[PDB]
């Protein structure tokens, strides 16, 4: 019963803030060029860009590269979000976050070069096996709790928690990716953004919201890892939102009592009554029955044996990812959106 590991976490976080602020103030820009990399294959796609596997030609190292079409980013009102993404990424440091290695831009596109995580998305693994066991789910949930404790101490909200954005590394640990919607926020913010299934009630109701929306998404994630489907689903988004705001959730018959209790406290529609956002903060979650067998330090130190390790076929193997149609990356002769992305 010696929680002076609390004082140790407090000391760690105070230091992490110093480091963050130092990097936040003097951000890195244009640390690479497009033809220093060999484009190999598409790992994922979006409305305003794509993510590719690339090979740094000098060093031979593989990376993931996110390519955003400036014109499409402007068209889709994502300018501020992409500047958030890069600025936050370059200033953070935590064992369960994908690391930004380089960023740059040319006439047509923004580029962010980051760690490649060859184990693929949690999403694919979960859909294939159906559901994870509670120990297996708990393993990942523990990493997300530590990650949000880190991010929130720096006033960062992540805002896109879902299996799709959690990659699994060679040791079975989580690497959080896609900081597209991440924002530094002291107090409230107002943008309607996220994935419908994972949207907190405050977001849906356009009232102004804070870091508590991430603890809500954690409830949805733990539920989906353990159930195999999310707590609120429907054919169309509109029906999903109505379910989210209703205050009604049903749990599989195989959910433990402890898990059901945790999830009722995470999926509280009133944010003032939600775990993570009460007086004791994250400690309400860390000290909850369901996490009773969790060694929080050992998990941070990566000393716990992972319940599942993806198949590794070598560096540059992408068999844990789906196939996407390929498109040649064209760079225009004329600079597009120069003013909009001058800070990038």
């Amino acid at each position: 019963k010696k929680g002076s590991e609390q004082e140790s976490v407090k000391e760690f976080l105070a230091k992490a803030k110093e480091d963050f602020l130092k990097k936040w103030e003097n951000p890195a820009q244009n640390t690479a060029h497009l033809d220093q990399f060999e484009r190999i294959k598409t790992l994922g796609t979006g409305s305003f860009g794509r993510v590719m596997l690339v090979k740094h030609m000098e060093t031979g190292n593989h990376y993931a590269m996110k390519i955003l079409d400036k014109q499409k980013v402007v068209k889709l009102k994502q300018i501020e979000h992409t500047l958030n993404e890069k600025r936050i990424l370059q200033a953070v440091n935590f064992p369960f976050l994908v690391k930004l290695e380089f960023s740059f831009k040319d006439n047509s596109n923004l580029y962010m070069v980051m760690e490649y995580v060859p184990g693929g998305e949690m999403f694919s693994h979960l859909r294939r096996i159906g559901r994870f066991s509670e120990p297996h789910a708990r393993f990942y949930a523990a990493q997300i709790v530590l990650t949000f404790e880190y991010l929130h101490s720096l006033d960062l909200i992540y805002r896109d928690l879902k299996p799709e954005n959690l990659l699994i590394d060679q040791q079975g640990y989580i690497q959080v990716t896609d900081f597209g919607f991440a924002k530094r926020v002291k107090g409230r913010t107002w943008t309607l953004c996220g994935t419908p299934e994972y949207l907190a009630p405050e977001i849906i109701l356009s009232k102004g919201y804070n870091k508590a929306v991430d603890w809500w998404a954690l409830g949805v994630l733990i539920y989906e890892m353990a159930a195999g489907y999310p707590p609120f689903f429907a054919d169309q988004p509109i029906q999903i939102y109505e379910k989210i705001v209703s205050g009604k959730v049903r749990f599989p018959s195989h959910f433990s009592s402890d898990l059901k209790d945790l999830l009722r406290n995470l999926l509280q529609v009133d944010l003032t009554k939600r775990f993570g956002n009460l007086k004791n903060g994250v400690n309400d979650i860390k000290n909850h029955k369901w996490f009773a067998t969790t060694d929080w330090i050992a998990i941070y130190q990566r000393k716990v044996e992972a319940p599942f390790i993806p198949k590794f076929k070598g560096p540059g193997d992408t068999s844990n990812f789906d196939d996407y149609e390929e498109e040649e990356i064209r760079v225009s002769i004329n600079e597009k959106c120069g003013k909009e992305f001058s800070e990038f």
Binding site: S47, K77, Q78, F181, C193, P196, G228, Y229, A234, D235
Partner: peptide
């Protein structure tokens, strides 16, 4: 069962953000 209804809905695949 809720699992069969989930497979029956159109939302078992990779989910896009709303964007905006």
């Amino acid at each position: 069962t809720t699992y069969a209804d989930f497979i029956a809905s159109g939302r078992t695949g990779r989910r896009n953000a709303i964007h905006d």
